[PDB]
Structures are given as structure tokens and as C-alpha cells.
Amino acid sequence: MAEDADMRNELEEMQRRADQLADESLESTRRMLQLVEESKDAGIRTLVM
Amino acid sequence: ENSIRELHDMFMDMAMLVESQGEMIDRIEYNVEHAVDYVERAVSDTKKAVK
């Protein structure tokens, strides 16, 4: 031999990102954490009143 | 989330509506015993008007 090979290689990016907006789905599921608590919080105390 | 928002609209309507009704219940709270405070107090003197 008396052989040195030092090499590099390249990447294939994974799928599932047609557009970044997809993470806005998380902004949705934030909102259905946002839009859920006050329903019961006023529901049970609406039963109280 | 939109469907829960639709029921959320109906529910903030519901709860604030029955809230607002609670003031008519406040006027009951007036007209439930102040009504007695006239009536029972009047019949305390008509029943004793026989005396």
C-alpha cells in the first residue's frame, strides 16, 4: 500500500418539508390548548353560579 | 380547532348569557323577600285588625 486516502461524501436531505408553514400546525395545536381551558374554567364555575 | 372555536363561541355566549341573567336573579333577590317584607308584614296587621 503506502496508501493514504482521505475522503468526503454528501448528504441526501429527508422529506416532509414542502414549505416551512407545516410547523404552523403546531401553532394550531397551541391554539387548541389556548381555546380549551376557558371552556371548562367557565363551565364548572358557571355551574357554581 | 375551528370546530372547538365554534362551540367556544356558543359557550362564551352561554356563560356570559347566564351571567347576565344573574342580574335578573338579583332583582329576584330584591323581589323575593322585600315582597315578603311587605306582604307578611301587612298580614301581621290585617290578621291583627280583627283585634
Side-chain angles (χ1 to χ4, degrees):
Chain A
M1 294 296 172
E3 190 277 332
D4 61 357
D6 292 331
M7 74 294 291
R8 70 283 303 278
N9 58 2
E10 293 82 3
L11 276 295
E12 295 296 330
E13 182 66 26
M14 295 296 172
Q15 226 197 357
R16 101 193 167 181
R17 177 255 182 199
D19 271 328
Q20 174 187 15
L21 62 85
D23 191 359
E24 294 179 353
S25 298
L26 184 62
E27 295 178 353
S28 178
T29 61
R30 294 282 76 79
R31 290 190 295 272
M32 68 86 205
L33 293 175
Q34 294 179 357
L35 282 72
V36 297
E37 70 276 17
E38 69 276 16
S39 296
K40 295 184 266 73
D41 291 331
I44 296 88
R45 278 82 67 192
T46 300
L47 295 175
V48 174
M49 62 81 71
Chain B
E1 66 182 2
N2 295 117
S3 296
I4 190 167
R5 179 266 183 88
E6 292 179 353
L7 62 84
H8 184 273
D9 291 331
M10 294 184 287
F11 181 75
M12 293 296 102
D13 189 358
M14 180 273 174
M16 283 63 258
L17 185 152
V18 176
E19 181 180 0
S20 296
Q21 293 178 356
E23 183 65 26
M24 187 281 289
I25 293 87
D26 291 331
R27 296 295 301 273
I28 296 170
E29 182 58 24
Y30 182 76
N31 289 317
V32 64
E33 292 293 328
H34 294 284
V36 176
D37 186 74
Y38 293 107
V39 175
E40 184 177 1
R41 188 179 297 276
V43 298
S44 65
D45 291 331
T46 62
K47 292 176 71 68
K48 292 182 180 180
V50 176
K51 292 181 181 179

